[PDB]
């Protein structure tokens, strides 16, 4: 909790230097499937980190992104997989990480 209390305090003292937004509601002239619109989050992030390697001139970085595990769900956009399940073949969140 103190780590999360740290980051929104250290972002607040930065005074919104890197505040690129992203809309899950697609733009009105998108006119396609909004699951494909969420490939827009990856090109805001890559626009964000390239702004961080250009105002501090650092190049050996390994970025981390921390978020709620419901807004990070927009990043992989994995498709479903059907198997015809039943009660005896029950995988209580087996390969979900």
């Amino acid at each position: 909790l103190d780590i999360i209390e740290f980051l929104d305090h250290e972002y607040k003292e930065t005074d919104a230097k890197y505040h690129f937004s992203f809309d899950v509601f697609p733009h009105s002239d998108y006119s396609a499937h909004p699951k494909d619109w969420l490939e827009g989050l990856r090109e805001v992030i890559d626009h964000t980190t390239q702004s961080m390697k250009n105002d501090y001139k650092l190049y050996d970085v390994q970025f981390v992104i921390v978020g709620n595990p419901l807004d990070v769900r927009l990043i992989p956009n994995v498709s479903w997989t059907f198997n015809g399940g039943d009660r005896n073949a029950d995988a209580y969140s087996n390969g979900i990480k």
Partner: protein, 97 residues
């Protein structure tokens, strides 16, 4: 690939240089011929000598010992073959409208 990249298109080969010192919002295409007869641009590094002490007076205050360094060079464009692409609205706000 965001800094050094080589593209082989249908019209010419390329050598894309990514340097963060140029102002964002533009591109610049520069011709380099192969044969030594024709010459668009050339860089001429003449000399570079550091002198430590050496009796050179200092201009901030003369009374202190003073190391000094300079570098003589010039740049030359015989024929002006350069191309400027304006990159409009690259603020990352393509997905936040």
């Amino acid at each position: 690939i965001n800094y050094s990249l080589g593209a082989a298109s249908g019209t010419a080969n390329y050598r894309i240089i990514g340097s963060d010192l140029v102002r964002q919002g533009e591109l610049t295409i520069i011709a380099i011929p192969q044969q030594d007869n024709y010459k668009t641009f050339m860089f001429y590094p003449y000399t570079f000598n550091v002198v430590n002490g050496g009796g050179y007076l200092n201009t901030r205050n003369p009374n202190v010992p003073n190391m000094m360094m300079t570098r003589r060079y010039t740049v030359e464009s015989f024929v002006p073959i350069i191309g400027r692409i304006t990159i409009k609205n690259n603020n990352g706000s393509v997905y936040a409208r």
